[PDB]
Design a protein around this motif. Sequence first.
Motif, PDB file in Angstrom:
ATOM      1  N   UNK A 155      -5.782   7.335 -12.564  1.00  0.00           N
ATOM      2  CA  UNK A 155      -4.371   7.052 -12.312  1.00  0.00           C
ATOM      3  C   UNK A 155      -3.808   6.080 -13.337  1.00  0.00           C
ATOM      4  N   UNK A 165      11.970   2.740  -4.016  1.00  0.00           N
ATOM      5  CA  UNK A 165      11.071   3.467  -3.127  1.00  0.00           C
ATOM      6  C   UNK A 165      11.394   4.956  -3.094  1.00  0.00           C
ATOM      7  N   UNK A 217       5.100   7.816   5.855  1.00  0.00           N
ATOM      8  CA  UNK A 217       5.581   9.160   5.561  1.00  0.00           C
ATOM      9  C   UNK A 217       4.423  10.082   5.199  1.00  0.00           C
ATOM     10  N   UNK A 265      -1.985  10.104  -6.660  1.00  0.00           N
ATOM     11  CA  UNK A 265      -3.244   9.479  -6.266  1.00  0.00           C
ATOM     12  C   UNK A 265      -4.096  10.417  -5.418  1.00  0.00           C
ATOM     13  N   UNK A 313     -14.751   5.945  -6.016  1.00  0.00           N
ATOM     14  CA  UNK A 313     -13.320   5.695  -5.904  1.00  0.00           C
ATOM     15  C   UNK A 313     -12.781   4.822  -7.031  1.00  0.00           C
ATOM     16  N   UNK A 340       2.187   9.073  -4.382  1.00  0.00           N
ATOM     17  CA  UNK A 340       1.045   9.363  -3.524  1.00  0.00           C
ATOM     18  C   UNK A 340       0.446  10.733  -3.790  1.00  0.00           C
ATOM     19  N   UNK A 365      -4.562   7.982   3.472  1.00  0.00           N
ATOM     20  CA  UNK A 365      -5.826   8.656   3.225  1.00  0.00           C
ATOM     21  C   UNK A 365      -6.942   7.754   3.722  1.00  0.00           C
ATOM     22  N   UNK A 407      -7.794  11.655  -6.422  1.00  0.00           N
ATOM     23  CA  UNK A 407      -8.910  11.569  -5.485  1.00  0.00           C
ATOM     24  C   UNK A 407      -9.584  12.922  -5.300  1.00  0.00           C
ATOM     25  N   UNK A 455       0.810  -1.217   0.000  1.00  0.00           N
ATOM     26  CA  UNK A 455       0.000   0.000   0.000  1.00  0.00           C
ATOM     27  C   UNK A 455       0.846   1.272   0.000  1.00  0.00           C
ATOM     28  N   UNK A 456       1.792   1.374   0.934  1.00  0.00           N
ATOM     29  CA  UNK A 456       2.517   2.628   1.135  1.00  0.00           C
ATOM     30  C   UNK A 456       3.471   2.888  -0.026  1.00  0.00           C
ATOM     31  N   UNK A 457       4.409   1.967  -0.256  1.00  0.00           N
ATOM     32  CA  UNK A 457       5.392   2.155  -1.316  1.00  0.00           C
ATOM     33  C   UNK A 457       4.835   1.844  -2.698  1.00  0.00           C
ATOM     34  N   UNK A 510       8.111   7.190  -4.050  1.00  0.00           N
ATOM     35  CA  UNK A 510       6.940   7.006  -3.204  1.00  0.00           C
ATOM     36  C   UNK A 510       6.349   8.318  -2.703  1.00  0.00           C
ATOM     37  N   UNK A 552       1.577   9.148   4.073  1.00  0.00           N
ATOM     38  CA  UNK A 552       1.114   8.623   2.792  1.00  0.00           C
ATOM     39  C   UNK A 552      -0.228   7.912   2.930  1.00  0.00           C
ATOM     40  N   UNK A 591      -8.975   5.546  -9.626  1.00  0.00           N
ATOM     41  CA  UNK A 591      -7.964   4.549  -9.946  1.00  0.00           C
ATOM     42  C   UNK A 591      -7.835   4.357 -11.454  1.00  0.00           C
ATOM     43  N   UNK A 635      -5.067   3.367  -4.435  1.00  0.00           N
ATOM     44  CA  UNK A 635      -5.550   4.731  -4.238  1.00  0.00           C
ATOM     45  C   UNK A 635      -5.239   5.269  -2.848  1.00  0.00           C
ATOM     46  N   UNK A 636      -4.930   4.409  -1.879  1.00  0.00           N
ATOM     47  CA  UNK A 636      -4.713   4.897  -0.526  1.00  0.00           C
ATOM     48  C   UNK A 636      -3.751   3.974   0.206  1.00  0.00           C
TER      49      UNK A 636
END
Lengths: 441, 478
Positions: B398, B350, A353, B360, B391, B357, A357, B364, A315-317, B353, A355, B395, A325-326
């Motif tokens: 994106x 990474x 970080x 995205x 939602x 975000x 929602x 959103x 999810x995060x990276x 990253x 990141x 996506x 999406x989150x």
Amino acid sequence: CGKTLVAKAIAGEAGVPFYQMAGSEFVEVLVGVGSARIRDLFKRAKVNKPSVIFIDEIDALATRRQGINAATQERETTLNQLLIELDGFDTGKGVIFLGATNRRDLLDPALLRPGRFDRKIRVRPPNAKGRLDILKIHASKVKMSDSVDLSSYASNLPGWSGAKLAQLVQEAALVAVRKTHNSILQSDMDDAVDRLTVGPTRIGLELGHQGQCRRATTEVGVAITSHLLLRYENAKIERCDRVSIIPRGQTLSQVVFHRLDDESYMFGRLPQLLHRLQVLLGGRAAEEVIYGSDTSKASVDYLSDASWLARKILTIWNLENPMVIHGEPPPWRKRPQFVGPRLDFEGSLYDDYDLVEPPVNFNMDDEVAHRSEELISQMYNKTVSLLRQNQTALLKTVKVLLNQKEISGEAIDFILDHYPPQTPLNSLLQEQNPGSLPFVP
Amino acid sequence: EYLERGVDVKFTDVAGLGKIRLELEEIVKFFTHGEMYRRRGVKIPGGILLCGPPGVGKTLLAKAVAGEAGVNFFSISASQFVEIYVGVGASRVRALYQEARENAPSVVFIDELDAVGRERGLIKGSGGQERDATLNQLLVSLDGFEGRGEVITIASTNRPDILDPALVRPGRFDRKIFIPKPGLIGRMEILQVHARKKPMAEDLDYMAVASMTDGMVGAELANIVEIAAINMMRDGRTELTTDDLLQAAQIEERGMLDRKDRSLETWRQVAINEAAMAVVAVNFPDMKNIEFLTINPRAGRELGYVRVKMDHIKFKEGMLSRQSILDHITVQLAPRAADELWYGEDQLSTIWAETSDNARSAARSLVLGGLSDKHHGLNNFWVADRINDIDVEALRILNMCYERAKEILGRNRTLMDEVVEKLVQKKSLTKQEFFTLVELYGSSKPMPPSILELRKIKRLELEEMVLKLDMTTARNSS
């Protein structure tokens, strides 16, 4: 970190009087006395120009008016007097005011405005060369033997402040006094290391023979997975130093891992994370292969870490390539810490970080959960398959560590070399002493 | 007690004034030509309130208007009124207004009224009651009973919404002047006046310095003046130039430039990241004017950055097109595009990253900001199916930006390699050489028409269709 020492050295090299009085000396019960002390210190500074004003722990008087007695009014009046004296200071008379603080967040932004605090200097914790030089300085005060190599201690103690190196050398001196040593030996220095890092050794405090076999199996399995991943696939992971089951501090057992260089701690690729995650499930792999199907609670924390880093990968990276999406914050937070698995490869593990929602669609959450379960299950089968192929080395390392209550990384490597894959367990079982180490360091 | 001496600040001492200065001299007129004001029958407005961002020097404006008015100046901090004891603050305000009335003609200044002008009934404590008492006392001494026609109050606040509407009542605070952030000329003149006390040169152009440091307050310009004194003795040149000012602005807006040990592949990764951002940005209209491109790590950002200065009028007002956001999401996704196209899918890093975000989050915000075309905007529904479908569009948006980024970065491989090599060799790049490389190895970028061409073609189509209707009516009728 010696910020006060830095200001004192500045005054010493400059040959100017140094005015030291801490922020906690500006707090009182009566109102207006602190502003009077501010005025008195400032005018005494203006007497002998040039001069340096130093206020240690300035955040004591400069606490931010957080919106989350009459002492607070005294703090605001002292802040007003200090800012009036700072703003009314003509720059031609050369009175430099120094402020040492431990936290930038609680300090008021009014002082950060130009015209009062024009310069902002960060005092980073000393690097390997910095800790080396601090060790050279502090080792000149106590008697030192030639067998002590301070480079290894500077490299293997990351982020340690100068006062912590001072307490290192002081406790080394006191340990040598306890041992009646004429000088600081390497054994006493390492004794101070294990006293301040993990803690002092207890006396005869041991649980049952089953309460130690499980912890030994978990730690030895983690070490064996790390060593095998280093040996075979050449992973970008750490190296085992020593593994212990002697209770120290509040850890009933411990495995020591070296810390690598931070330049490899920025672009954590997918394979590096997968091998570190295999290393995390190495403990449960050990319980599942040694005990068959009766696992225990000694490897639950590693399971939680693996489960959270799988989510962080997903999810995060967003390392895989269905786009998400989150991200989600960690429900549980464990701080990065000592000898246990590093979990700070990207600065930290349990720190998103910002990141995250709040989700809206609840149908992709289950697909994320299924993806995480598939990754964790596949990775679990791979780590159990790789560890089950070497039962002899694992069992011999467990027996040797149980007999000796401590094993080294070189001993684990020797066991791995002397026990090749696919050899029968009867070869270990026919030995006169399975917990015997013929290798001498 | 609250009276200050040596108020020599005038309107010449303060820059970035504009038409507000006119109101300021109107205040001076209120202190000089008030005889015909009351002869015509005009009561002098006592309440003038300056509202704006901090650091613009509202108290400096107070000193300027007091010096130009030529009257007694009172400058009182509002933080002294609030106290753990009650009644003493009301007596402080009483003594303040009594000595202001005795020293008539005079002007009184109180700064940061948000501390004591808070609406009553927001905090439950004795401090709230003391604040209410002080507010009541200042209200009465302002408008309560007759006896003041000469004392004029000037105030400086930051948040105008916090103030009590009782204070905002005309006759107490009726003149409300906003001090905006300095624009282009305002930053120029503030830099000039803050730099008049230091020896400057004749080839010193403030236009580049003002355009470099956009959207900053006058205190920040004074800070730029303060970092125009300390950093030239390292090399030891003769006279201050604009290069030092540009470097000081670059240091201030981001941080000090520190160099650390670094390998070759790390530099390559940061270079391909910055190349992805700049190369995907130059083909888009809103982010076309890339001026700087460096991979040097700074304070808080171990990555590099790409510098663009788009038009800052549509962004503030909200006139950004739907395509202007689908382009930015592609820009944020393009670092991951370069990483995937260069290191393969299985070796994603990474480092992107932080942009992946932002893309995205922007998608959103777009799908529930009413900018979509699912039914027609309609960011809210009632049944759970449409809420779940809300939602889905983000996506897919994106994904389409993602494939667009792949196509854009795959069209430009040669210039990609060239700019990565240049970024590794030089660690920095300006607009001229980067654009020269773009012209040397760029691909075709057919620009979509703007709104003017669309309006013209629609207008000519409408005219030809309506004249076709005219003839089909006429020759069928005649």
